[PDB]
RNA sequence: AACCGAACGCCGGGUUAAGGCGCCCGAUGCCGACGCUCAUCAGACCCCAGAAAAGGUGUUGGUUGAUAUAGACAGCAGGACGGUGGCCAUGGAAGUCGGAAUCCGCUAAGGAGUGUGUAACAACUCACCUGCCGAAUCAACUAGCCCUGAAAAUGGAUGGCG
RNA sequence: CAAGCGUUCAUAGCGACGUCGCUUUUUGAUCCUUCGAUGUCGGCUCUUCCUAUCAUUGUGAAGCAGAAUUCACCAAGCGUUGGAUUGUUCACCCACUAAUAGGGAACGUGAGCUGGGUUUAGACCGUCGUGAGACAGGUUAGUUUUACCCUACUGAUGAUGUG
RNA sequence: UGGGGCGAAGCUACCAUCUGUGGGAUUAUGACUGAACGCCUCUAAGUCAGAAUCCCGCCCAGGCGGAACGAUACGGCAGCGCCGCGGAGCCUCGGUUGGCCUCGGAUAGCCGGUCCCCCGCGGGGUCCGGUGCGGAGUGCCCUUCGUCCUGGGAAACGGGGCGCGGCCGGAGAGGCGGCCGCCCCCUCGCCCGUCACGCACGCCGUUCGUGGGGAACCUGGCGCUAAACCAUUCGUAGACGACC
C-alpha cells in the first residue's frame, strides 16, 4: 500500500539559520556550519516558516520502506541543530585489571596514542576525523574527551579507538580491559 | 537518421544502450559511442562485480591466451555486449562491429561535436529511482583498469575548456537577441510571415 | 582419481613462456614512482658483467651469531664505465597507455652510438644523423629544437634520456654501443628538461646515479644452455632405472579427458637465454678506474683501508673469460643473472 | 525420435495453429492495463530438465481474536507488600534445586510468585498496580511475493546476449 | 521436530521415537552405448579441479581464566611428509611435523613406465570328480608392439599489415 | 678411453652461493549515525574498520594493436618527395545540404540582469526579473535549388581571385581551426518590373560528398642522394633454423 502522504516538521530554534540547497541541507549556528546530502533519499524539503521557524520534509507517494526514511532526515537535522547550537562530547572511561592504558593526544586531536594496553608493546595510533577534537580530561582519572559538531564524526571516532582496543584469543567476558564510550552529550547542554 | 552518431554513454544503461546501438549498426548507420565510463548498470554495485568476477574465473584451462579475452576497459566491456547482440561468427556481423566504434572519455573529433543521448536506455527513465548502482568506470576499475585516473583528470581538463565555448556561444546569443532588438522594424514583416506559419512564438 | 601423496608443482607459472628472449640489454619495464619535491636524478644505468670474488667484511647486525664477526660474502664485479647522454624523449599519459611525442638527440652524437643502428656498417656509408645534426645550427634550430621542449614542457609528464655506453673503453670485442632510455624521476618538469638540456653530449658516472650501499634491482638475461629436457628445464623427477623409453621425462601429461596436454605441464624446451628482473642486491663498492696523474692508480680499486696494498680487482690474469676492468665497476653482493661480458641494466 | 500444430506435386498472393515480438531474430520503435518483487545464489514457461520438511515483525494482502479517551499501546518515575522460616521438603527453598498447592488483609496492588540469582536471603527484577504522556495499539494464524535449507570436481550457461 | 544427557539447564556441547533431504569417493539394481574386441587390477611420475577445511590468515562459539579445546563463517590462499610390513587398493605400527583432511578428472594417467597381483598355454599341493577334468581352494616360471600422419602443448622459424 | 694420481677450462649440486619485492574493493565479522518501530535497534536511506580472500602492483610473455625519431637509393645504366599546377584510364565502391561542441538534475532545472559583495575581460557569491509538457525547443538552427539580360525599390562594402605573407590557439589517438597586412577582381540576400537560356516534341539509374579510394602513364621547381638480406666473421647464442 502506497500513503498518499506523510511529513514532518523539525522545529528550528532562533539562534541557527538553516537554509537548503535544494535538497542539500546547510545549517549555520553559533559554533559553525555543518553540510549534509539528501541526494538518495528523495524527499521534499520545504523550509516554509517565515522568519524562520519550520523544516517540513514532505514524502509524498511512498510505501512503507521509504516513509520510514521521512522520520530519519529529520532526525540528522535535529541531529545537526544540537551539533552547532550546543556540540556532542562523548566521554570514554579507559578500563583495566592490570596494565595502565596510558594515552596521549599528539597534534591537536587527530593522533590518539595508546601503550600498554594489556602489556602489548604495539603502541596503537588512531585518527580522528576531521572536526573532532579530542583531549585527554580532567576531574577524573582515565577518561578522554572527543568534541565535534558532527554526531557521525565523533562517535566513528569514539568507535575507532573503542574498536582499536579489543582483545584476541581470550574470554572477553574475564578480559574486560580497552577503552569504551561511558557518556554520550553535549559540551553546553542549556 | 542519416550520418555518422554520437552517443554519449553517461547515464545509460548497459545493454539496454547497445542493444539500440547494435540495431542501427545491423542497418549500416555509424555509431561511435562515447564516454564509457560514465555508463551505468542496474544492480548494485558489487553484484555486478561479484557477475564480472565470474567472468574472470571462465578461463580456457588448457590454455588461457585462447580462452576468453575479459578485456577491462569500459569502451572495451559495452563492446563486448553490443558484438554479443550481433551475428558476429558472419561477415555481416563483422561488418557491422566496424561500423561501431567505442571509447573511454571524450577524444579529438568528439569533444567537437554536439551528441546525442538515447532515452529509452537512459538510466533515470528506465530505473526506478530507489534502486542501486554501478558505475561501469568503478566496475572497470576494480576489475584491472589502468586509467581511472587518468581519463578523469584529462576529461576535467575537457571541461574547463568545453566551458569557455559554452560561455563564448553565451555571449553570441545574447548578441543575437540584443541585435533581435536592436532592428525590430526592417525585420518586422518577416518576423511576422515566420509567426503566422508557426515558426518562432 | 585423486594424487595419493601431494606435492608442489615443478617450477613456476608466473614465468613461463620460456623462451629465447627477444632482446639482450635488459629492458627496465617499471621506472620507479617520481616523487615531485626530491632533486633530480637518473634512475638506472648500464654496467656489464666481470667475474667474481671473496670479500671480507664485518657484520653490525645485533642480536645474530654473527654480529662483530668476519664473514666472506661473495660478489659480482660489474664494469661500469660512464654513459653519454644523446637524446631525451617525452612521455605523456594517455587513456590508451603512455605514448612517445618528441625524441631530440644533440648536434653531434658519437660513433659507437652510430653502431647502435645499421646492422652491417662497414658495408654502409655511415649516414645517420647527418641531417639531424644539421639542425643544431640555423633558423629551424629554433623552430624543430626550441618550440619543441616548450611543447614537451607543457603538455609532457614523464620525461626519459637516451643514453649509449661507451664500448670503445672496454676489452669486449664488441664496439656498438648500449642504448637505453633512463627515466628521469626528478621535480618537476622543466626543472627535469633544463638539466637535460645541459646534459647533452655530457659524460655520466656511476656516482651521479648510484650511492655505496643502496639496494638495487639488476636486469638482465639469463645465461644460454640450449634445448634441454623435462628434467633439466623444469627440473622434473627422473624415472627409475628401468624405464623402457627414455627416464628423463615425465610419465603422465595429463589425463585421457581435458583432452590437450595443458598449459602447465613441463617440457621440454629452451632453458637460459631468458630475459629476468632480478631484485633488491646490495652495492658493496662503486669503484674507480685507474687514471693517471702522474703514472696510474691501479691502487684505487681493490685496496680497502684494512689491507692497504695496492690492487686492482683484476685477479693474476684478468676476470677469466672477458679482461682487466679498467674503469669504474660496482661491485655487488652475491651472483647476477648472465654470462660474462654480458650488458647488465 | 516420441511433446504442440500441423502431414508435406511445384509456385504468387492472402490468412492462420502451436508459438512468438529490446537485439542475435522476423514482430510492440503500443506515450498498452492492473498488480507483485530487488535476490551478498534473482527470476524468468506443458516434457522439461530441479529441491523439502522446514524456516524466514525480507515486504504485500487476508483471517480471526484482542485492546482503548472511565483516556490503553509503547516510552521515562513509584510500589511490587503484609498475614508469613506459609506448607512440603532441611540440603537448602522464609515467593523462589523440585511438588500439594493454594487464600485473606493492606487492598490500589502486588502471584504465598516470573525470573536473576542466592546454600538460604538479600539486593535486584518481573506479574499486579501506579506517576508522567497523548490515539490508535496488539497477538496468533493464513497466504502472496524474496531472503535461508542449498555442498562437487577440463571454464560457464533463463538459448545467448542481456 | 523434538523425549533425554549435560550437577542445575533441551538445544555450550550433545541428543532418543520420528521425519525431510542432498551426494555421488561405497556397494546394488538396470542393461542405454561398445563384442570388424575402447588394453582388465595395483604402483611409480605429473598436471589440474572440487570441497566433503587436516593445518595456516581473519573471524564469530563454548560448560573459554590462563593454558589447553572442541561448535560454527568467509575461506580453498599456500600445506598434507619419511618409513616397517603388505601384489594390493584397503589396513596397522614407528617416526617426524603443522597436517600428517577427503575427493574427482574413462573407477585421471600400458604407443608414460613397471608388471607385484588378477587372468592363457608349463607346473605343484588341498578338496571334489569314477575321469577328462573342476575349484575368489593354496603355490613357482611365464614375449607387454607401432608415432612419420591431424591435433594440444613446448620451444623455433616465420606471416599479411606499417612505403 | 690399456690402467690409475693429480687436474685448467666448461657444465653442475639445501652438496657451494645469491635474490624473492606493494596497493585497492570489500566476506565473515565486528562497528557509527538512524529510521520502520513517539524506545530499541550494523540498516529500512546513509557511514566506518576488515583477510593466507578477490582484483590489481611489482614479475614474465608480448596483437592481423599502437609510438617516437634516423636514412631514404649518383650512377657505370637509376628512381623518386614535395609543391604546384598540367593531359589519357584499368578498377573499387558506399553515398546523393550541413549543424562548429557546456555541466549535469531529475521530488528539479534554464536563462537574464546585477544595484551590491568577493576572486582571477572573465570566475564565485547574494538580490531581483523572466522562461520552464521546455520557443537563444535536436518537435530543434542554418543555407539554399533551373542560368543570366536590364532597370526600379528594399538592402550596400559584402564576396571572391586553391588571391597572396605574419602572429596565434588547439595535442588523449591535434589535425584543424583561429586571428592580422597587400595586390587585382567582382556588387551578389528580399520585393518587383523586364526580358531571356535546345520548348528534345507524359518515361529509367535525374542532382552531390568527387579534383573520391586505389592501380597504371604525358609537363615545370626544388631537393634527394640506401639500406636490408646472402657470403664472411664472431660468439653473448645452437638442431637446424633463430641471436650478439
Ligand atoms: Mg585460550
Ligand atoms: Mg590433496
Ligand atoms: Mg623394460
Ligand atoms: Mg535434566
Ligand atoms: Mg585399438
Ligand atoms: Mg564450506
Ligand atoms: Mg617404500
Ligand atoms: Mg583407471
Ligand atoms: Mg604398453
Ligand atoms: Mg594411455
Ligand atoms: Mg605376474
Ligand atoms: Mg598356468
Ligand atoms: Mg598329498
Ligand atoms: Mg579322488
Ligand atoms: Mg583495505
Ligand atoms: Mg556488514
Ligand atoms: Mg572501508
Same mark, same amino acid.
Given at each position: 500500500?502506497?500513503?498518499?502522504?506523510?511529513?514532518?516538521?523539525?522545529?528550528?530554534?532562533?539562534?541557527?539559520?538553516?537554509?537548503?540547497?535544494?535538497?542539500?541541507?546547510?545549517?549555520?549556528?553559533?559554533?559553525?556550519?555543518?553540510?549534509?546530502?539528501?541526494?538518495?533519499?528523495?524527499?521534499?524539503?520545504?523550509?516554509?516558516?517565515?522568519?524562520?521557524?519550520?523544516?517540513?520534509?514532505?514524502?509524498?507517494?511512498?510505501?512503507?520502506?521509504?516513509?520510514?526514511?521521512?522520520?530519519?532526515?529529520?532526525?540528522?537535522?535535529?541531529?545537526?541543530?544540537?551539533?552547532?547550537?550546543?556540540?556532542?562530547?562523548?566521554?570514554?572511561?579507559?578500563?583495566?585489571?592490570?596494565?595502565?592504558?596510558?594515552?596521549?593526544?599528539?597534534?591537536?586531536?587527530?593522533?590518539?596514542?595508546?601503550?600498554?594496553?594489556?602489556?602489548?608493546?604495539?603502541?596503537?595510533?588512531?585518527?580522528?576525523?576531521?572536526?573532532?577534537?579530542?583531549?585527554?580530561?580532567?576531574?577524573?582519572?582515565?577518561?578522554?574527551?572527543?568534541?565535534?559538531?558532527?554526531?557521525?564524526?565523533?562517535?566513528?571516532?569514539?568507535?575507532?579507538?573503542?574498536?582499536?582496543?579489543?582483545?584476541?584469543?581470550?574470554?572477553?567476558?574475564?578480559?574486560?580491559?580497552?577503552?569504551?564510550?561511558?557518556?554520550?552529550?553535549?559540551?553546553?547542554?542549556? | 537518421?542519416?550520418?555518422?552518431?554520437?552517443?554519449?554513454?553517461?547515464?545509460?544503461?548497459?545493454?539496454?544502450?547497445?542493444?539500440?546501438?547494435?540495431?542501427?549498426?545491423?542497418?549500416?548507420?555509424?555509431?561511435?559511442?562515447?564516454?564509457?565510463?560514465?555508463?551505468?548498470?542496474?544492480?548494485?554495485?558489487?553484484?555486478?562485480?561479484?557477475?564480472?568476477?565470474?567472468?574472470?574465473?571462465? +578461463?580456457?584451462?588448457?590454455?588461457?591466451?585462447?580462452?576468453?579475452?575479459?578485456?577491462?576497459?569500459?569502451? +572495451?566491456?559495452?563492446?563486448?555486449?553490443?558484438?554479443?547482440?550481433?551475428?558476429?561468427?558472419?561477415?555481416?556481423?563483422?561488418?557491422?562491429?566496424?561500423?561501431?566504434?567505442?571509447?573511454?572519455?571524450?577524444?579529438?573529433?568528439?569533444?567537437?561535436?554536439?551528441?546525442?543521448?538515447?532515452?529509452?536506455?537512459?538510466?533515470?527513465?528506465?530505473?526506478?529511482?530507489?534502486?542501486?548502482?554501478?558505475?561501469?568506470? +568503478?566496475?572497470?576499475?576494480?576489475?584491472?583498469?589502468?586509467?581511472?585516473?587518468?581519463?578523469?583528470?584529462?576529461?576535467?581538463?575537457?571541461?574547463?575548456?568545453?566551458?569557455?565555448?559554452?560561455?563564448?556561444?553565451?555571449?553570441?546569443? +545574447?548578441?543575437?537577441?540584443?541585435?533581435?532588438?536592436?532592428?525590430?522594424?526592417?525585420?518586422?514583416?518577416?518576423?511576422?510571415?515566420?509567426?503566422?506559419?508557426?515558426?518562432?512564438? | 582419481?585423486?594424487?595419493?601423496?601431494?606435492?608442489?608443482?615443478?617450477?613456476?607459472?608466473?614465468?613461463?613462456?620460456?623462451?629465447?628472449?627477444?632482446?639482450?640489454?635488459?629492458?627496465?619495464?617499471?621506472?620507479?614512482?617520481?616523487?615531485?619535491?626530491?632533486?633530480?636524478?637518473?634512475?638506472?644505468?648500464?654496467?656489464?658483467?666481470?667475474?667474481?670474488?671473496?670479500?671480507?667484511?664485518?657484520?653490525?647486525?645485533?642480536?645474530?651469531?654473527?654480529?662483530?664477526?668476519?664473514?666472506?660474502?661473495?660478489?659480482?664485479?660489474?664494469?661500469?664505465?660512464?654513459?653519454?647522454?644523446?637524446?631525451?624523449?617525452? %612521455?605523456?599519459?594517455?587513456? !590508451?597507455?603512455? !605514448?612517445?611525442?618528441?625524441?631530440?638527440?644533440?648536434?653531434?652524437?658519437?660513433?659507437?652510438?652510430?653502431?647502435?643502428?645499421?646492422?652491417?656498417?662497414?658495408?654502409?656509408?655511415?649516414?645517420?644523423?647527418?641531417?639531424?645534426?644539421?639542425?643544431?645550427?640555423?633558423?629551424?634550430?629554433?623552430?624543430?629544437?626550441?618550440?619543441?621542449?616548450?611543447?614537451?614542457?607543457?603538455?609532457?609528464?614523464?620525461?626519459?634520456?637516451?643514453?649509449?655506453?661507451?664500448?670503445?673503453?672496454?676489452?669486449?670485442?664488441?664496439?656498438?654501443?648500449?642504448?637505453?632510455?633512463?627515466?628521469?624521476?626528478?621535480?618537476?618538469?622543466?626543472?627535469?628538461?633544463?638539466?637535460?638540456?645541459?646534459?647533452?653530449?655530457?659524460?655520466?658516472?656511476?656516482?651521479?646515479?648510484?650511492?655505496?650501499?643502496?639496494?638495487?634491482?639488476?636486469?638482465?638475461?639469463?645465461?644460454?644452455?640450449?634445448?634441454?629436457?623435462?628434467?633439466?628445464?623444469?627440473?622434473?623427477?627422473?624415472?627409475?632405472?628401468?624405464?623402457?623409453?627414455?627416464? !628423463?621425462?615425465?610419465?603422465?601429461?595429463?589425463?585421457?579427458?581435458?583432452?590437450?596436454?595443458?598449459?602447465?605441464?613441463?617440457?621440454?624446451?629452451?632453458?637460459?637465454?631468458?630475459?629476468?628482473?632480478?631484485?633488491?642486491?646490495?652495492?658493496?663498492?662503486?669503484?674507480?678506474? %685507474?687514471?693517471?696523474?702522474?703514472?696510474?692508480?691501479?691502487?684505487?680499486?681493490?685496496?680497502?683501508?684494512?689491507?692497504?696494498?695496492?690492487?686492482?680487482?683484476?685477479?693474476?690474469?684478468?676476470?677469466?673469460?672477458?679482461?682487466?676492468?679498467?674503469?669504474?665497476?660496482?661491485?655487488?653482493?652475491?651472483?647476477?643473472?648472465?654470462?660474462?661480458?654480458?650488458?647488465?641494466?
Amino acid at each position: 500500500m502506497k500513503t498518499i502522504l506523510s511529513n514532518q516538521t523539525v522545529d528550528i530554534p532562533e539562534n541557527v539559520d538553516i537554509t537548503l540547497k535544494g535538497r542539500t541541507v546547510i545549517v549555520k549556528g553559533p559554533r559553525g556550519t555543518l553540510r549534509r546530502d539528501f541526494n538518495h533519499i528523495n524527499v521534499e524539503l520545504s523550509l516554509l516558516g517565515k522568519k524562520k521557524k519550520r523544516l517540513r520534509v514532505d514524502k509524498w507517494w511512498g510505501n512503507r520502506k521509504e516513509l520510514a526514511t521521512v522520520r530519519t532526515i529529520c532526525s540528522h537535522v535535529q541531529n545537526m541543530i544540537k551539533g552547532v547550537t550546543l556540540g556532542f562530547r562523548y566521554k570514554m572511561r579507559s578500563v583495566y585489571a592490570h596494565f595502565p592504558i596510558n594515552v596521549v593526544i599528539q597534534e591537536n586531536g587527530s593522533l590518539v596514542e595508546i601503550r600498554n594496553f594489556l602489556g602489548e608493546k604495539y603502541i596503537r595510533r588512531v585518527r580522528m576525523r576531521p572536526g573532532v577534537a579530542c583531549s585527554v580530561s580532567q576531574a577524573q582519572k582515565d577518561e578522554l574527551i572527543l568534541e565535534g559538531n558532527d554526531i557521525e564524526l565523533v562517535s566513528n571516532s569514539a568507535a575507532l579507538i573503542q574498536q582499536a582496543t579489543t582483545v584476541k584469543n581470550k574470554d572477553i567476558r574475564k578480559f574486560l580491559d580497552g577503552i569504551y564510550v561511558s557518556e554520550k552529550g553535549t559540551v553546553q547542554q542549556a | 537518421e542519416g550520418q555518422v552518431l554520437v552517443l554519449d554513454g553517461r547515464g545509460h544503461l548497459l545493454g539496454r544502450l547497445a542493444a539500440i546501438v547494435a540495431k542501427q549498426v545491423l542497418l549500416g548507420r555509424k555509431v561511435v559511442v562515447v564516454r564509457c565510463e560514465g555508463i551505468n548498470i542496474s544492480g548494485n554495485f558489487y553484484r555486478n562485480k561479484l557477475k564480472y568476477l565470474a567472468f574472470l574465473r571462465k +578461463r580456457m584451462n588448457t590454455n588461457p591466451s585462447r580462452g576468453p579475452y575479459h578485456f577491462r576497459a569500459p569502451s +572495451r566491456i559495452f563492446w563486448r555486449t553490443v558484438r554479443g547482440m550481433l551475428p558476429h561468427k558472419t561477415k555481416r556481423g563483422q561488418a557491422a562491429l566496424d561500423r561501431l566504434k567505442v571509447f573511454d572519455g571524450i577524444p579529438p573529433p568528439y569533444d567537437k561535436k554536439k551528441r546525442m543521448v538515447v532515452p529509452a536506455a537512459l538510466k533515470v527513465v528506465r530505473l526506478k529511482p530507489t534502486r542501486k548502482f554501478a558505475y561501469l568506470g +568503478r566496475l572497470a576499475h576494480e576489475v584491472g583498469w589502468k586509467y581511472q585516473a587518468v581519463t578523469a583528470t584529462l576529461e576535467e581538463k575537457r571541461k574547463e575548456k568545453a566551458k569557455i565555448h559554452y560561455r563564448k556561444k553565451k555571449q553570441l546569443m +545574447r548578441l543575437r537577441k540584443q541585435a533581435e532588438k536592436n532592428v525590430e522594424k526592417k525585420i518586422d514583416r518577416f518576423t511576422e510571415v515566420l509567426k503566422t506559419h508557426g515558426f518562432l512564438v | 582419481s585423486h594424487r595419493k601423496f601431494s606435492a608442489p608443482r615443478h617450477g613456476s607459472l608466473g614465468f613461463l613462456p620460456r623462451k629465447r628472449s627477444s632482446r639482450h640489454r635488459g629492458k627496465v619495464k617499471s621506472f620507479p614512482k617520481d616523487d615531485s619535491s626530491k632533486p633530480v636524478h637518473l634512475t638506472a644505468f648500464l654496467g656489464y658483467k666481470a667475474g667474481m670474488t671473496h670479500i671480507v667484511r664485518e657484520v653490525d647486525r645485533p642480536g645474530s651469531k654473527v654480529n662483530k664477526k668476519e664473514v666472506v660474502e661473495a660478489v659480482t664485479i660489474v664494469e661500469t664505465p660512464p654513459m653519454i647522454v644523446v637524446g631525451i624523449v617525452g %612521455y605523456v599519459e594517455t587513456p !590508451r597507455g603512455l !605514448r612517445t611525442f618528441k625524441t631530440i638527440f644533440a648536434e653531434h652524437i658519437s660513433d659507437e652510438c652510430k653502431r647502435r643502428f645499421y646492422k652491417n656498417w662497414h658495408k654502409s656509408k655511415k649516414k645517420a644523423f647527418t641531417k639531424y645534426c644539421k639542425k643544431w645550427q640555423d633558423a629551424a634550430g629554433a623552430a624543430a629544437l626550441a618550440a619543441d621542449f616548450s611543447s614537451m614542457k607543457a603538455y609532457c609528464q614523464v620525461i626519459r634520456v637516451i643514453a649509449h655506453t661507451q664500448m670503445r673503453l672496454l676489452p669486449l670485442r664488441q664496439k656498438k654501443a648500449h642504448l637505453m632510455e633512463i627515466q628521469v624521476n626528478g621535480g618537476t618538469v622543466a626543472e627535469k628538461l633544463d638539466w637535460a638540456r645541459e646534459r647533452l653530449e655530457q659524460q655520466v658516472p656511476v656516482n651521479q646515479v648510484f650511492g655505496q650501499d643502496e639496494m638495487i634491482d639488476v636486469i638482465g638475461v639469463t645465461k644460454g644452455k640450449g634445448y634441454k629436457g623435462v628434467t633439466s628445464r623444469w627440473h622434473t623427477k627422473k624415472l627409475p632405472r628401468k624405464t623402457h623409453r627414455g627416464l !628423463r621425462k615425465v610419465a603422465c601429461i595429463g589425463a585421457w579427458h581435458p583432452a590437450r596436454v595443458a598449459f602447465s605441464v613441463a617440457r621440454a624446451g629452451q632453458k637460459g637465454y631468458h630475459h629476468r628482473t632480478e631484485i633488491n642486491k646490495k652495492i658493496y663498492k662503486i669503484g674507480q678506474g %685507474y687514471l693517471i696523474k702522474d703514472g696510474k692508480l691501479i691502487k684505487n680499486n681493490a685496496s680497502t683501508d684494512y689491507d692497504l696494498s695496492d690492487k686492482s680487482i683484476n685477479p693474476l690474469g684478468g676476470f677469466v673469460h672477458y679482461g682487466e676492468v679498467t674503469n669504474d665497476f660496482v661491485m655487488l653482493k652475491g651472483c647476477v643473472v648472465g654470462t660474462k661480458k654480458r650488458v647488465l641494466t
